[PDB]
Amino acid sequence: LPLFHIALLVLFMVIIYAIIGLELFKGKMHKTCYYIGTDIVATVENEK
Amino acid sequence: VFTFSVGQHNYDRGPIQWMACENKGYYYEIPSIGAIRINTQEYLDVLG
Amino acid sequence: RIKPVFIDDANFRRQVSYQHAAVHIPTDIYEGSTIVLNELNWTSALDDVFKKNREEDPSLLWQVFGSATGLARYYPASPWVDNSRTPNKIDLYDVR
Amino acid sequence: KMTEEECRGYYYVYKDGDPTQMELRPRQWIHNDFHFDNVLSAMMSLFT
Amino acid sequence: QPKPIGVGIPTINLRKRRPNVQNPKSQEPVTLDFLDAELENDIKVEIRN
Ligand SMILES: *[C@@H]1O[C@H](CO)[C@@H](O[C@@H]2O[C@H](CO)[C@@H](O[C@@H]3O[C@H](CO)[C@@H](O)[C@H](O)[C@@H]3O)[C@H](O)[C@H]2NC(C)=O)[C@H](O)[C@H]1NC(C)=O
Protein backbone atom coordinates (compact mmCIF):
# COMPACT_ATOMS: atom_id res chain seq x y z
CA LEU A 1 0.00 0.00 0.00
CA PRO A 2 2.62 2.70 0.83
CA LEU A 3 4.16 2.28 -2.64
CA PHE A 4 0.96 3.56 -4.28
CA HIS A 5 2.18 7.17 -4.37
CA ILE A 6 5.50 6.12 -5.91
CA ALA A 7 3.73 4.12 -8.61
CA LEU A 8 1.43 7.07 -9.33
CA LEU A 9 4.42 9.40 -9.65
CA VAL A 10 6.19 6.93 -11.95
CA LEU A 11 3.11 6.60 -14.15
CA PHE A 12 2.70 10.37 -14.46
CA MET A 13 6.39 10.82 -15.27
CA VAL A 14 6.14 8.13 -17.94
CA ILE A 15 3.11 9.92 -19.41
CA ILE A 16 4.87 13.29 -19.48
CA TYR A 17 8.04 11.91 -21.04
CA ALA A 18 6.03 9.90 -23.56
CA ILE A 19 4.17 13.01 -24.70
CA ILE A 20 7.37 15.08 -24.86
CA GLY A 21 9.02 12.40 -26.98
CA LEU A 22 5.88 12.21 -29.10
CA GLU A 23 6.16 15.91 -29.86
CA LEU A 24 9.92 15.86 -30.42
CA PHE A 25 10.80 12.63 -32.26
CA LYS A 26 7.55 11.82 -34.08
CA GLY A 27 8.16 10.27 -37.48
CA LYS A 28 11.91 10.94 -37.52
CA MET A 29 13.40 7.42 -37.51
CA HIS A 30 12.02 6.35 -40.88
CA LYS A 31 15.10 6.72 -43.12
CA THR A 32 17.96 4.25 -43.39
CA CYS A 33 20.49 3.84 -46.17
CA TYR A 34 19.50 1.08 -48.58
CA TYR A 35 21.67 -0.12 -51.44
CA ILE A 36 21.50 1.40 -54.93
CA GLY A 37 17.99 0.86 -56.27
CA THR A 38 17.26 -2.15 -54.04
CA ASP A 39 15.24 -2.79 -50.88
CA ILE A 40 18.25 -4.15 -48.96
CA VAL A 41 19.53 -2.31 -45.90
CA ALA A 42 23.29 -1.72 -45.95
CA THR A 43 25.16 -2.38 -42.71
CA VAL A 44 28.48 -3.81 -41.51
CA GLU A 45 29.33 -7.00 -39.62
CA ASN A 46 28.22 -6.26 -36.05
CA GLU A 47 26.05 -3.18 -36.66
CA LYS A 48 22.30 -3.21 -36.19
CA VAL B 1 16.29 -45.59 -47.56
CA PHE B 2 18.47 -42.51 -47.07
CA THR B 3 17.32 -40.29 -44.22
CA PHE B 4 18.20 -36.64 -43.66
CA SER B 5 17.91 -34.72 -40.38
CA VAL B 6 17.55 -31.05 -41.29
CA GLY B 7 18.01 -28.04 -39.03
CA GLN B 8 18.84 -27.47 -35.39
CA HIS B 9 16.25 -29.04 -33.10
CA ASN B 10 15.79 -31.11 -29.96
CA TYR B 11 13.75 -33.94 -31.51
CA ASP B 12 14.89 -37.54 -31.30
CA ARG B 13 17.09 -38.65 -34.20
CA GLY B 14 17.45 -42.32 -33.28
CA PRO B 15 14.39 -43.53 -35.21
CA ILE B 16 15.55 -42.00 -38.48
CA GLN B 17 19.07 -43.40 -38.06
CA TRP B 18 17.49 -46.82 -37.56
CA MET B 19 15.36 -46.31 -40.67
CA ALA B 20 18.52 -45.32 -42.54
CA CYS B 21 20.77 -48.26 -41.69
CA GLU B 22 18.10 -50.90 -41.48
CA ASN B 23 17.16 -50.67 -45.18
CA LYS B 24 20.70 -50.60 -46.62
CA GLY B 25 20.85 -46.82 -46.57
CA TYR B 26 22.70 -43.97 -44.88
CA TYR B 27 22.00 -41.12 -42.46
CA TYR B 28 22.95 -37.47 -43.01
CA GLU B 29 22.63 -34.25 -41.03
CA ILE B 30 22.13 -30.83 -42.61
CA PRO B 31 22.31 -28.15 -39.90
CA SER B 32 22.98 -25.09 -42.08
CA ILE B 33 23.21 -23.89 -45.67
CA GLY B 34 26.93 -24.63 -45.83
CA ALA B 35 26.23 -28.33 -45.29
CA ILE B 36 23.72 -28.77 -48.12
CA ARG B 37 26.11 -29.01 -51.06
CA ILE B 38 28.33 -31.63 -49.46
CA ASN B 39 25.58 -33.68 -47.79
CA THR B 40 23.16 -33.89 -50.74
CA GLN B 41 25.82 -35.43 -53.02
CA GLU B 42 27.47 -38.07 -50.80
CA TYR B 43 24.66 -40.60 -51.27
CA LEU B 44 26.48 -41.71 -54.44
CA ASP B 45 29.19 -43.34 -52.33
CA VAL B 46 26.64 -45.90 -51.12
CA LEU B 47 25.13 -46.49 -54.57
CA GLY B 48 28.54 -47.41 -55.98
CA ARG C 1 54.21 -24.60 -55.61
CA ILE C 2 55.09 -24.62 -59.31
CA LYS C 3 55.35 -21.69 -61.73
CA PRO C 4 54.50 -22.94 -65.24
CA VAL C 5 55.52 -21.31 -68.51
CA PHE C 6 52.03 -21.32 -70.09
CA ILE C 7 52.62 -21.11 -73.81
CA ASP C 8 49.54 -20.40 -75.88
CA ASP C 9 47.93 -23.22 -77.78
CA ALA C 10 45.48 -24.23 -80.45
CA ASN C 11 42.63 -26.66 -79.90
CA PHE C 12 42.77 -24.90 -76.53
CA ARG C 13 41.72 -21.28 -76.80
CA ARG C 14 43.85 -20.65 -73.71
CA GLN C 15 47.45 -20.86 -72.55
CA VAL C 16 48.44 -24.37 -71.49
CA SER C 17 51.57 -26.07 -70.17
CA TYR C 18 52.30 -29.62 -71.28
CA GLN C 19 54.97 -30.29 -68.65
CA HIS C 20 52.73 -31.08 -65.68
CA ALA C 21 49.10 -31.31 -64.58
CA ALA C 22 47.04 -28.72 -62.74
CA VAL C 23 45.07 -29.37 -59.56
CA HIS C 24 41.70 -27.82 -58.70
CA ILE C 25 40.61 -27.90 -55.06
CA PRO C 26 37.19 -26.44 -54.16
CA THR C 27 37.16 -23.17 -52.26
CA ASP C 28 35.60 -24.53 -49.06
CA ILE C 29 37.91 -27.58 -48.95
CA TYR C 30 41.20 -26.86 -47.19
CA GLU C 31 44.37 -27.81 -49.04
CA GLY C 32 47.05 -29.15 -46.76
CA SER C 33 44.81 -31.58 -44.90
CA THR C 34 46.08 -35.09 -44.32
CA ILE C 35 43.38 -36.37 -46.69
CA VAL C 36 44.20 -33.78 -49.35
CA LEU C 37 47.99 -34.00 -49.07
CA ASN C 38 47.83 -37.77 -49.51
CA GLU C 39 45.83 -37.45 -52.72
CA LEU C 40 48.35 -34.97 -54.11
CA ASN C 41 51.10 -37.45 -53.19
CA TRP C 42 49.92 -40.54 -55.05
CA THR C 43 47.99 -38.85 -57.87
CA SER C 44 51.16 -37.20 -59.13
CA ALA C 45 52.07 -40.49 -60.78
CA LEU C 46 49.38 -39.76 -63.38
CA ASP C 47 51.36 -37.01 -65.14
CA ASP C 48 53.52 -39.56 -66.94
CA VAL C 49 50.41 -41.36 -68.21
CA PHE C 50 48.87 -38.02 -69.18
CA LYS C 51 51.93 -37.14 -71.26
CA LYS C 52 52.11 -40.63 -72.79
CA ASN C 53 48.44 -40.40 -73.78
CA ARG C 54 49.07 -37.04 -75.43
CA GLU C 55 52.19 -38.23 -77.26
CA GLU C 56 50.30 -41.27 -78.57
CA ASP C 57 47.45 -39.08 -79.90
CA PRO C 58 48.26 -35.34 -80.13
CA SER C 59 44.59 -34.35 -80.60
CA LEU C 60 43.48 -35.14 -77.03
CA LEU C 61 41.58 -32.50 -75.08
CA TRP C 62 41.40 -32.35 -71.26
CA GLN C 63 42.14 -35.55 -69.36
CA VAL C 64 40.94 -35.27 -65.77
CA PHE C 65 40.86 -37.45 -62.66
CA GLY C 66 38.03 -36.49 -60.33
CA SER C 67 38.84 -37.57 -56.79
CA ALA C 68 36.31 -38.58 -54.16
CA THR C 69 37.92 -35.97 -51.88
CA GLY C 70 36.92 -33.09 -54.16
CA LEU C 71 40.29 -32.91 -55.90
CA ALA C 72 40.56 -32.69 -59.68
CA ARG C 73 43.84 -33.25 -61.53
CA TYR C 74 43.64 -32.38 -65.22
CA TYR C 75 46.10 -32.20 -68.11
CA PRO C 76 47.55 -30.06 -69.61
CA ALA C 77 48.11 -27.46 -66.89
CA SER C 78 46.05 -24.32 -67.47
CA PRO C 79 45.00 -21.56 -65.06
CA TRP C 80 41.51 -21.94 -63.67
CA VAL C 81 38.86 -19.76 -65.26
CA ASP C 82 37.69 -18.25 -61.93
CA ASN C 83 40.33 -17.69 -59.27
CA SER C 84 39.36 -17.52 -55.61
CA ARG C 85 39.02 -13.87 -54.56
CA THR C 86 41.25 -11.63 -56.69
CA PRO C 87 38.05 -10.15 -58.20
CA ASN C 88 34.73 -9.77 -56.38
CA LYS C 89 33.77 -13.19 -57.81
CA ILE C 90 34.30 -16.70 -56.44
CA ASP C 91 33.94 -20.15 -57.96
CA LEU C 92 31.56 -22.93 -56.95
CA TYR C 93 33.00 -25.99 -58.70
CA ASP C 94 32.98 -29.36 -56.97
CA VAL C 95 34.03 -32.20 -59.26
CA ARG C 96 31.68 -34.54 -57.39
CA LYS D 1 34.55 -27.44 -38.03
CA MET D 2 35.01 -28.95 -34.57
CA THR D 3 38.78 -28.72 -34.04
CA GLU D 4 41.64 -26.28 -34.51
CA GLU D 5 43.24 -28.22 -37.36
CA GLU D 6 39.95 -28.48 -39.26
CA CYS D 7 39.23 -24.75 -38.74
CA ARG D 8 41.53 -23.69 -41.58
CA GLY D 9 40.95 -22.32 -45.05
CA TYR D 10 37.92 -20.37 -46.27
CA TYR D 11 34.17 -20.83 -45.97
CA TYR D 12 31.03 -19.17 -47.30
CA VAL D 13 28.77 -16.78 -45.41
CA TYR D 14 25.23 -16.22 -46.67
CA LYS D 15 23.73 -12.75 -46.37
CA ASP D 16 20.16 -12.57 -45.05
CA GLY D 17 20.00 -16.36 -45.26
CA ASP D 18 19.91 -16.34 -49.05
CA PRO D 19 21.73 -19.38 -50.50
CA THR D 20 22.58 -17.42 -53.66
CA GLN D 21 24.25 -14.43 -51.96
CA MET D 22 27.65 -15.58 -50.72
CA GLU D 23 30.94 -14.12 -49.52
CA LEU D 24 34.28 -15.68 -48.60
CA ARG D 25 35.70 -15.50 -45.10
CA PRO D 26 38.84 -17.12 -43.70
CA ARG D 27 38.31 -19.75 -41.02
CA GLN D 28 39.89 -18.85 -37.67
CA TRP D 29 39.82 -20.59 -34.29
CA ILE D 30 38.24 -17.97 -32.04
CA HIS D 31 38.64 -17.96 -28.27
CA ASN D 32 35.90 -16.38 -26.17
CA ASP D 33 36.82 -13.05 -24.61
CA PHE D 34 35.57 -14.19 -21.20
CA HIS D 35 36.57 -17.77 -20.44
CA PHE D 36 37.40 -20.09 -17.53
CA ASP D 37 40.89 -21.20 -18.50
CA ASN D 38 42.47 -20.10 -15.21
CA VAL D 39 41.26 -18.65 -11.92
CA LEU D 40 41.88 -15.06 -13.01
CA SER D 41 39.80 -15.32 -16.17
CA ALA D 42 37.14 -17.22 -14.22
CA MET D 43 36.97 -14.40 -11.67
CA MET D 44 36.73 -11.84 -14.48
CA SER D 45 33.88 -13.77 -16.12
CA LEU D 46 32.08 -14.11 -12.79
CA PHE D 47 32.52 -10.40 -12.11
CA THR D 48 30.83 -9.63 -15.42
CA GLN E 1 24.09 -24.09 -80.41
CA PRO E 2 26.58 -23.39 -77.60
CA LYS E 3 23.86 -21.54 -75.69
CA PRO E 4 22.30 -23.34 -72.70
CA ILE E 5 18.80 -24.77 -73.01
CA GLY E 6 16.23 -22.32 -71.69
CA VAL E 7 13.26 -23.23 -69.53
CA GLY E 8 10.09 -21.27 -68.79
CA ILE E 9 10.07 -17.48 -68.65
CA PRO E 10 12.98 -15.68 -66.92
CA THR E 11 11.68 -13.78 -63.89
CA ILE E 12 14.04 -11.72 -61.74
CA ASN E 13 13.55 -9.39 -58.78
CA LEU E 14 16.01 -6.51 -59.14
CA ARG E 15 15.10 -5.14 -55.70
CA LYS E 16 16.65 -8.07 -53.80
CA ARG E 17 19.94 -8.18 -55.69
CA ARG E 18 23.12 -7.30 -53.81
CA PRO E 19 25.86 -6.00 -56.12
CA ASN E 20 28.80 -8.02 -54.72
CA VAL E 21 27.61 -11.59 -54.15
CA GLN E 22 28.57 -13.67 -57.26
CA ASN E 23 25.42 -15.68 -57.82
CA PRO E 24 25.74 -18.95 -59.78
CA LYS E 25 25.12 -18.90 -63.52
CA SER E 26 24.24 -22.41 -64.78
CA GLN E 27 25.30 -26.05 -64.68
CA GLU E 28 22.69 -27.91 -66.76
CA PRO E 29 23.61 -29.87 -69.91
CA VAL E 30 22.56 -28.91 -73.41
CA THR E 31 19.99 -31.65 -74.02
CA LEU E 32 17.99 -30.83 -77.15
CA ASP E 33 15.66 -33.48 -78.52
CA PHE E 34 15.69 -34.36 -82.20
CA LEU E 35 12.05 -33.34 -82.57
CA ASP E 36 12.80 -29.98 -80.93
CA ALA E 37 15.64 -29.22 -83.36
CA GLU E 38 13.61 -29.58 -86.58
CA LEU E 39 9.94 -29.33 -87.45
CA GLU E 40 8.00 -32.15 -85.82
CA ASN E 41 6.33 -34.50 -88.31
CA ASP E 42 4.50 -37.81 -88.17
CA ILE E 43 7.21 -39.49 -90.26
CA LYS E 44 10.18 -37.94 -88.45
CA VAL E 45 8.92 -39.45 -85.19
CA GLU E 46 8.87 -42.87 -86.85
CA ILE E 47 12.39 -42.34 -88.24
CA ARG E 48 13.70 -41.24 -84.84
CA ASN E 49 12.12 -44.21 -83.07
C1 LIG F 1 54.82 -39.23 -52.17
O2 LIG F 1 55.83 -38.49 -51.49
C3 LIG F 1 56.89 -39.32 -51.00
C4 LIG F 1 57.82 -38.42 -50.22
O5 LIG F 1 58.01 -37.18 -50.90
C6 LIG F 1 57.59 -40.03 -52.16
O7 LIG F 1 58.51 -40.97 -51.61
C8 LIG F 1 59.87 -40.71 -52.02
O9 LIG F 1 60.17 -41.36 -53.26
C10 LIG F 1 61.52 -41.16 -53.71
C11 LIG F 1 61.62 -41.82 -55.06
O12 LIG F 1 60.74 -42.93 -55.16
C13 LIG F 1 62.50 -41.72 -52.69
O14 LIG F 1 63.83 -41.48 -53.11
C15 LIG F 1 64.58 -42.72 -53.01
O16 LIG F 1 65.44 -42.71 -51.87
C17 LIG F 1 66.18 -43.94 -51.69
C18 LIG F 1 66.97 -43.84 -50.39
O19 LIG F 1 66.09 -44.07 -49.30
C20 LIG F 1 67.09 -44.15 -52.92
O21 LIG F 1 67.77 -45.39 -52.79
C22 LIG F 1 66.26 -44.14 -54.21
O23 LIG F 1 67.12 -44.26 -55.34
C24 LIG F 1 65.39 -42.89 -54.31
O25 LIG F 1 66.27 -41.79 -54.50
C26 LIG F 1 62.25 -41.07 -51.33
O27 LIG F 1 63.08 -41.68 -50.35
C28 LIG F 1 60.79 -41.24 -50.92
N29 LIG F 1 60.54 -40.58 -49.66
C30 LIG F 1 60.35 -41.24 -48.51
C31 LIG F 1 60.11 -40.39 -47.30
O32 LIG F 1 60.37 -42.46 -48.46
C33 LIG F 1 56.58 -40.77 -53.03
O34 LIG F 1 57.21 -41.26 -54.21
C35 LIG F 1 55.41 -39.86 -53.42
N36 LIG F 1 54.41 -40.61 -54.15
C37 LIG F 1 54.42 -40.73 -55.49
C38 LIG F 1 53.32 -41.54 -56.09
O39 LIG F 1 55.28 -40.19 -56.18
**Max CA separation in chain B (angstroms):** 33
Q: How far apart are the first and last CA of chain A?
A: 43
**Helical (H) or strand (E) element with B28:** strand B26-30
Chains B and C touch (3+ CB pairs under 8 A): yes
Instruction: Give C75: exposed, middle or buried? Use CB within 10 Å, 0-12, 13-18, 19+.
Output: buried
Cβ separation D14–B36 shorter than 8 A: no
Q: Is D1 in contact with D27 (CB distance < 8 Å)? A: yes
What residues of chain A lie within 8 A of the CB of E13, using their CB?
none
Give D10's strand partners.
Answer: D26
List the chains bordering chain B where 3 or more Cβ pairs fall under 8 Å.
Answer: C, D
For chain E, say whether A41 makes contact (Cβ under 8 Å): no
Which of the residues E18, E20, E21, E23 would you substitute to probe the A interface, choosing the one with the greatest number of A C-beta atoms within 10 Å?
A: E18
Q: Is C30 in contact with D9 (CB distance < 8 Å)? A: yes
- Phi, psi for D47 (deg, rounded to 5): -65, -45
Alpha carbons C21 and C53: distance in angstroms, whole number: 13
Q: Is B34 in contact with D12 (CB distance < 8 Å)? A: yes
Q: Dihedral through CA E40, CA E42, CA E46, CA E49, nearest 10? A: 40
For chain C, say whether D22 makes contact (Cβ under 8 Å): yes
List the chains bordering chain E where 3 or more Cβ pairs fall under 8 Å.
Answer: A, C, D
Local structure of residue C61 (DSSP, 8 states): -
Resolution in angstroms, to 1 decimal, for this deposition? 3.0
| DSSP codes of every residue in D13-47 | EEGGG-TT-EEEEE------SS--SSHHHHHHHHH
SS3 (DSSP) at C45: helix
Count of beta carbons in the 10 Å neighbourhood of residue D22: 20
